[PDB]
Amino acid sequence: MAKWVCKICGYIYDEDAGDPDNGISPGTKFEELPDDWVCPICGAPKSEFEKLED
């Protein structure tokens, strides 16, 4: 699956890994993340993430 980088801190949201400690199971797409989901490191909103691809 895809990887998304937080343009603030560099945290990589790995869709294959998810974010289980914050209520996100593995295999959760970035677009499927809750609107109130924020980067688990710095708390940046989803608007500050960029998809790693061409």
Curated annotation (Swiss-Prot):
Record keywords: Electron transport, Iron, Metal-binding, Transport
InterPro entries: Rubredoxin, Rubredoxin-like_dom, Rubredoxin_dom, Rubredoxin_ET, Rubredoxin_Fe_BS
GO BP field: alkane catabolic process
GO MF, one annotated term: iron ion binding
Presence of keyword Metal-binding: yes
Pfam families: Rubredoxin
Positions bound to Fe cation: C6, C9, C39, C42
Named cofactor requirement(s): Fe(3+)
Temperature note: Extremely thermostable, being unaffected after incubation for 24 hours at 95 degrees Celsius.
Cofactor note: Binds 1 Fe(3+) ion per subunit.
Residues of the Rubredoxin-like domain: 2-52
Function: Rubredoxin is a small nonheme, iron protein lacking acid-labile sulfide. Its single Fe, chelated to 4 Cys, functions as an electron acceptor and may also stabilize the conformation of the molecule.
The family this protein is said to belong to: Belongs to the rubredoxin family.
Protein name in UniProt: Rubredoxin
Species of the source: Pyrococcus furiosus (strain ATCC 43587 / DSM 3638 / JCM 8422 / Vc1)
Gene that encodes it: rub
